[PDB]
Amino acid sequence: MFDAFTKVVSQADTRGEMLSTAQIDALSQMVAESNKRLDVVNRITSNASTIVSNAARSLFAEQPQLIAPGGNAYTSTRMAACLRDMEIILRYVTYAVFAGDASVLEDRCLNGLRETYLALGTPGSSVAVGVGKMKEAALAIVNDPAGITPGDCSALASEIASYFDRACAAVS
Amino acid sequence: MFDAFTKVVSQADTRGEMLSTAQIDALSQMVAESNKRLDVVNRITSNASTIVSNAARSLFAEQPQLIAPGGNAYTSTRMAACLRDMEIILRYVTYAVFAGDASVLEDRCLNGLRETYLALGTPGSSVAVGVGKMKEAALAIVNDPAGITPGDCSALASEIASYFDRACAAVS
Amino acid sequence: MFDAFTKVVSQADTRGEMLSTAQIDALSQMVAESNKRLDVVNRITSNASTIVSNAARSLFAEQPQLIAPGGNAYTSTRMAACLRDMEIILRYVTYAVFAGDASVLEDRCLNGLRETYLALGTPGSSVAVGVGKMKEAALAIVNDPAGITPGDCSALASEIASYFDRACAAVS
Amino acid sequence: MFDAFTKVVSQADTRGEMLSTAQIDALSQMVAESNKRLDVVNRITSNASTIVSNAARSLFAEQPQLIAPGGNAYTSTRMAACLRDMEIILRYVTYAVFAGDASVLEDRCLNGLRETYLALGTPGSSVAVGVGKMKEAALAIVNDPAGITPGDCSALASEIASYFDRACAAVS
Amino acid sequence: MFDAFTKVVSQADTRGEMLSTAQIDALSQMVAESNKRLDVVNRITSNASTIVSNAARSLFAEQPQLIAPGGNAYTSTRMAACLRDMEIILRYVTYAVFAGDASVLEDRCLNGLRETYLALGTPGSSVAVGVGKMKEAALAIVNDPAGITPGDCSALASEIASYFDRACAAVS
Amino acid sequence: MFDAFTKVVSQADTRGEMLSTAQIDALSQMVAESNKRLDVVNRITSNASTIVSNAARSLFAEQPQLIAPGGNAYTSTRMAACLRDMEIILRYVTYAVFAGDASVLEDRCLNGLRETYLALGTPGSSVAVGVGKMKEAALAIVNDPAGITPGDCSALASEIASYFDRACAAVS
Amino acid sequence: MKTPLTEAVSVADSQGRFLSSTEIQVAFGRFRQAKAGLEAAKALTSKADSLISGAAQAVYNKFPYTTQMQGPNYAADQRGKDKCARDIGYYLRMVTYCLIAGGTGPMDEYLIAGIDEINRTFELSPSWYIEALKYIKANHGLSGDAAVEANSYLDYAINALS
Amino acid sequence: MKTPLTEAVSVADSQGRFLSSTEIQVAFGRFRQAKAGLEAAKALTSKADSLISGAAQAVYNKFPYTTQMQGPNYAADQRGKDKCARDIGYYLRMVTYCLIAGGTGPMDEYLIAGIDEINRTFELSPSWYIEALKYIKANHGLSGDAAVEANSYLDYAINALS
Amino acid sequence: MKTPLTEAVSVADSQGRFLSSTEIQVAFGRFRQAKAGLEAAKALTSKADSLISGAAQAVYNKFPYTTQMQGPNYAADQRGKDKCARDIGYYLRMVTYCLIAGGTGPMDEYLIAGIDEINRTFELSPSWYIEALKYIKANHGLSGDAAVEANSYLDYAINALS
Amino acid sequence: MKTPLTEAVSVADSQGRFLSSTEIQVAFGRFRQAKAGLEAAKALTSKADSLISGAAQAVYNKFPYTTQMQGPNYAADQRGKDKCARDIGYYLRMVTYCLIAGGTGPMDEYLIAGIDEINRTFELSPSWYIEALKYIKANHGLSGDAAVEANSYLDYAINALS
Amino acid sequence: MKTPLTEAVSVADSQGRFLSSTEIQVAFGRFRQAKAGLEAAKALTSKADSLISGAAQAVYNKFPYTTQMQGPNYAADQRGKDKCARDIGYYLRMVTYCLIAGGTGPMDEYLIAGIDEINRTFELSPSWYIEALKYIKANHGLSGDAAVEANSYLDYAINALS
Amino acid sequence: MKTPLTEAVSVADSQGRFLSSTEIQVAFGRFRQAKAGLEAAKALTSKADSLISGAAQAVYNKFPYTTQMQGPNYAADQRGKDKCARDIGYYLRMVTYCLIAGGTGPMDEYLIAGIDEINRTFELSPSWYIEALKYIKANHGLSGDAAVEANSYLDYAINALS
Numbered sequence A, B, C, D, E, F: 001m002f003d004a005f006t007k008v009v010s011q012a013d014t015r016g017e018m019l020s021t022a023q024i025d026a027l028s029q030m031v032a033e034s035n036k037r038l039d040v041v042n043r044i045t046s047n048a049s050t051i052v053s054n055a056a057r058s059l060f061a062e063q064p065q066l067i068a069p070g071g072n073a074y075t076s077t078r079m080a081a082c083l084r085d086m087e088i089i090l091r092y093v094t095y096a097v098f099a100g101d102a103s104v105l106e107d108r109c110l111n112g113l114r115e116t117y118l119a120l121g122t123p124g125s126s127v128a129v130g131v132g133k134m135k136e137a138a139l140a141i142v143n144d145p146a147g148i149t150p151g152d153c154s155a156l157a158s159e160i161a162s163y164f165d166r167a168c169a170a171v172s
Numbered sequence G, H, I, J, K, L: 001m002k003t004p005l006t007e008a009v010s011v012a013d014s015q016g017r018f019l020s021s022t023e024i025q026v027a028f029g030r031f032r033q034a035k036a037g038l039e040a041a042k043a044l045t046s047k048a049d050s051l052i053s054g055a056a057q058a059v060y061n062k063f064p065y066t067t068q069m070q071g072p073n074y075a076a077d078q079r080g081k082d083k084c085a086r087d088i089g090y091y092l093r094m095v096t097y098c099l100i101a102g103g104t105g106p107m108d109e110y111l112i113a114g115i116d117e118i119n120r121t122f123e124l125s126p127s128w129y130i131e132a133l134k135y136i137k138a139n140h141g142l143s144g145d146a147a148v149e150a151n152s153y154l155d156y157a158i159n160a161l162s
């Protein structure tokens, strides 16, 4: 996997180059804003199970066919499985945010997922809706002005939404 | 795997229903005829090795190309393996009978078998002929009137043939 | 795997035949020339690391793109791997020579290799060039008149080139 | 392991004898009273978790040192493990009752246990106290006249007490 | 393990010395007589199963308690195992002879065996009697003048008896 | 394993107490001087191989019997193994220093070691001499005034010496 | 699944053995019990509605807060009451399945496995369901073997939740 | 061992489970079968001597060479005739054990495991024993369940040797 | 255990590596955090009694039934009320330990592992403890980094219980 | 397969090694043995017919019942006598192969592996074949190393069957 | 790879855990170190050409035979002199990479793994490179934390080669 | 160890087999080669001192810097010159052992395993030893099979070091 640094480093290496001082300045900038990154990781994590449970509940109300007997989330093995996936996707999104690079999320979570769902009969579009709701709730928790040093987190919010969107796209 | 009971149960769960009293009566019926079912399992089992050896002998007499040097059942490693498969198919057929449902036979024995033989160069048609022979001998042993309380075992004979027929189909 | 003997045996078995005295005489001939065979194996083996190192060095000089940063043999993991493959192919070549039958080289080394390289991005044509250079150096070392009882090794030289050619073909 | 039958069979075999008809009558007897045995198994089993939890609670009340910080059942890892042992012993006691022979309980549960606890720093005597408590509650459940065909279960109650006692002795 | 060569080598290495020409001449002597060594290996091996079966038979006739119900070789699992041990000892004795050094027999067969038998309840003295019988039959087969170039095999006979003796001592 | 913090925590837990503001104050003190601790870890680490090689060379000079043929460090397998043990001890000492607690060194390295050496024939006293040499060179490297902010590192030197001495004691 | 028939086959298959007198005895066990079991499932089915309301009301009685705390995990509104009756329905339905099959299998598979995660996740209390099951035992009205078998499944659920 | 009671326990123990209705059904199966089984063991025991001689005799009739080839694997002498009766004895005895236990277990463990090595090693022919077993079947004179169960064990030995 | 120092060593050990700049940076991270963390642990310790009562009372307020249902899993008597305070005490004490160590480790080891079994076994509701923890967050009165780190441990217990 | 050449190569390959003096000495051993071995295969081939009938006849003599018991495993009819000679043919042919290759390999692979199952399944007696091999030994008329090596494969078959 | 950020994630992922305070402290470590580290990479980059020649020259000075033995593994011709400077460049470039990433990772992956096989294969002496690295240490002219971290990577390469 | 006799036995043992013609052929190979091999070990032994000095000197000539750089890895003093000859002695001694045992075994075990660590650790150059070995080849003065086998061990050492 890559973090924001080693992503740049690996690209440099295949060119046999040292980083341009422009590149280094970009990284310096990312460093200077890292407190905000870490806050976002802590906040999302600190609400993982309400993020997950709420989105799940909400999804089910919108899509009752999912939990009607016969639906993919009917029976406890399956509901459990379904909740577990929500948590997993959220886990890997937080990883990518912390590392500052989508690779962990791409490689270990999303890659091959669309095919896994197809084979199982799980409706991807539905998962994506789930992911769509977690993303909203997450961002709202990130952006909450209470209890934090006031500043602009909007670039970060934009990045975090990016990672959620990838997850949703990867199962759609 | 399913037995006759859990097969119905699993269908009823996917519909979120309890069994209709019709369905319960059908299962009662199967219970009432269960002594015959157990007799059939016992009798085929108690003759497994003559069922297998006679069918095998017969098959080879019909198809000498199988045991001519060059042929798929030539050499001890292969003859052994070939006899072993006959025994295996017979075993799973008796399982299905005992359980009153094809699933065990389908899932753990026949599924993937055609592909195995294709890859090996084993002539499936020939295995099917062997199965065919085992089926005749089995049924004759099942239907033998001597040494048993007389009754009608015809529906059961029909079911037992069914299972044999599935196996032959699965390699043809 | 087969050696020269068991190759012929295995053929004879699929026909149900004992070997024709023509076939035995062919083997006797191979036995009578076997000291040369063993010399060739010993000689190539005794020079394995210069055979490999010189061919590799040479290859890189002809194909600098391989070791330019970005190239498939750039970075130590990859250079080591690439030298290791060189060594491996030569190892199996000497096996086939010692056994007097290509099977070991075919089965355990070449089969699947084209695909491996394709998947990895390794340029097979390049490997073939390396194999090709090893081949030249091996034969020269085999044919060196110094320090050995003079005789004709040409048939053997022909065989050994055969094996190298197979390896080159198998990745081309 | 042995059940009541095979226990006697194994003993007869090491003497090369068939069972004396005295021996067979003894087994017939045990068969005739088998409904009671099965009730006892069903009854204890159907109350496993109140048998365990109540004993456990009671033990801790008598021995608070066990759940004072520093005591062997302080911390959740430990309390879990402790309750888990209670449940395990109880499970093996029910097995010995169902099979009508102590072997399963001796072989797979008690043997080596004294030594495991010594090594860990778990106070055996305390475990014994817990087993004793489960014993009382078990027997009361077994002997409850409510909801059952009335009859004499005393010999069985004596057997069951035996198994518990063995478990207590084995850690004492 | 050691063979006759590496035994001497290993001893020379712990002294940091090359072999004394006396020590080399000793090994040359062993080399010169090697054809007889190989004959002995072939001949015992070629009769393994009569060597074993005959000794086992004779042992049981001398020691009927062994095969009386209750005795260590009673039941098929046990007789099989007992026969198997006879064959094993014989196998490792032949190894020792072939290698010209006791180490393979010592390390992989005899070491720990006394203790295995003690724990099992197998009467070692008995096994020793069995070994002692295999020894007699083996040597008679070695020393048979028929069908071989006449010569003196006495030193070898002495060595072979040595190995059987070790085995018998190792369980006595 | 414990680090300085969790060692104190675990002790508090077994008493069921929160840390005394005394104990917190002691940890605060350790935190304030932590830059020096990390320098010591870096410094020893950055010289691991000269620390080891120099120590080992010196040991052998003092103790030639170790590398005379027959001696425990004679032969390449053994010399390698001996050098490896030197490196391993030094690695675990640096661990204990970094964690500020002897546990990792005690648990995963020293415990059982005396017995290992006994069984192998390795002279522990010698290993302790080696360790003792490593200790000297390490401390000299730690205490070197060149290239660092001047300050007092004596308490830390005293600690570090402690860990080495434990290792030496553990094999003595 | 855990049912006498499929478990007999499973052991046999896992040992590479044709069935023997042992497995046939199992079958005998199952088929004789089935008489009681089937009858019991029928009876339970025909009392379905009554037993479900009955139980739900029992739970609300033992735990009144559940009919009046705000929040999706309770039954203060219709939504919640429906969920609760649904779940109880599920338990009863499984108990009928177990009776039909002659083993816990169906409940193990469709209900028990992962129940812990759900109740933890959705803040449902096992205590509540235990009451529901207790009520069904006291009020199913079966007798003889039908009663004893049914109860075993009910006590099985209870043990699973405690 | 393969008996209904010990297998019930083993599956439970291997799954870390308390026994349930399934295993109790197994025990039911076993205990009803036991009535026939025990009675059959009784009958076989009391005909022991006759069945054994009769079988031995049957074998010597089908395979006359065995009463007259020299060599330790045959019964041309008293020694051989005694071994042969002994072995047949052993088979019968195991068949009684199986009846008593309700499964092939005792035969699997005392007799079947390693049989192939013995017969190979000592050059005994399975065909001979098969004949002994076929004779027992024809002549035990059991009827009803006793007969069926006893035969299942005799055919089981036969299948094991063929 | 999960603490920056011990995990740095563990990775290194599992990889057979001497420590490098990476692990030194970890220590840097830990030691800088520790200034806040230690102060925080101090503050919580000196408010121990007040936070505990306050929390217990909050749980009793949100869930009044727990102060008046008969039975050992509730706090309708002194015994119960003591247990409940004791448990809350434990949570707080763990949160201090976590601050001191710089990670969840101590809570993971002494409290989190096996929690699920206890609550299931003793019929304690995770909902209750979540309220206790919410109260401690709202009332510990820390600020700055101390507050953020302490809350991360409190929300971590919360996540573990939901 | 088990032959000096392919075993030399296999050890080497499993050790990831180029071949060395050791494996070269193995080839030397094989190549010197081959002079005798090949000549021996030739001689055996040119007596094929005589050795086969001779042997068959030898078996029928030792075991007359085989030429007259009804039933497919015996040689009472032409069919059975053909099968029997065929099988003996196979044993001889394998023995030639082993001489050619210089090891048991061909026999191990084509004949030995699974023989036990065949003889058990089709009720063929190993004793019978052992006699055939004994006869081939007594009558192949080889001498010197040819004889020693050939017998080694004949006794090997014998051992395999006892 | 070995960097603070990716290692943090790896441990977490291998443990199936969301990130906690521990991993956030790691990141803090990394981000504070990054200020020095990045500045250090910049300074080393701007002195690239001078440091590389200087080092090369240092090696040729300590080991003069290298500028005059015939043969491809030496720097007696332009070809060799270029290679040597190329390799020293690689070392420097990796050292910058390490500073950027905050760990040995880039060096481990791109350069260290397999270095032993190269030097053995091409007869390059680790001693030579060690001198280059020593020179770079003496001459990079960094100070403060930038020097300390840079040197840790240079010493790391040195340890790897000795 | 790698020698024809012990490998023969190992393959057999790992296969659970008695030895056969294959393993006997291996021994034949070994025993015939031994005539040459033993005589070669003798001749090497009697030229020991001359060969060792000779080689050490060759090394010092090819690599003059080794007799005059300061530092414990070189031969600029008596101590270093003694070490060097010692080591060459060790290589020669192993070559004799390999001839005696008929394989690389003794060299693999006593010398080759771990050599890479030593030379890395003590900064010894493989190049130097290669020259020693080349010298021994050019000067042992053996002929015929003695020469060819001896050289195979010398080249073997050389391949191990490059």
Ligand SMILES: C=CC1=C(C)/C(=C/c2[nH]c(/C=C3N=C(/C=C4\NC(=O)C(C)=C4C=C)C(C)=C\3CCC(=O)O)c(CCC(=O)O)c2C)NC1=O
Pocket: B032, B033, B034, B035, B036, B038, B039, B040, B042, B142, B143, B144, B145, B148, B149, B150, B151, B152, B153, B156, G021, G024, G025, H033, H144, H145, H148, H149, H152
């Ligand atoms: C442990 C071994 C064991 C076996 C093998 C066994 C068999 C068995 N077969 C049975 C019945 C029977 N078996 C048959 C069998 C046949 N009817 C046919 O037409 C054909 C020819 C056959 C079988 C296909 C019939 C008709 C009945 C009576 C109907 C019934 O009881 O279901 C019965 C019930 C009682 C009886 O009539 O004796 C048993 C117990 N019981 C055992 O305990």
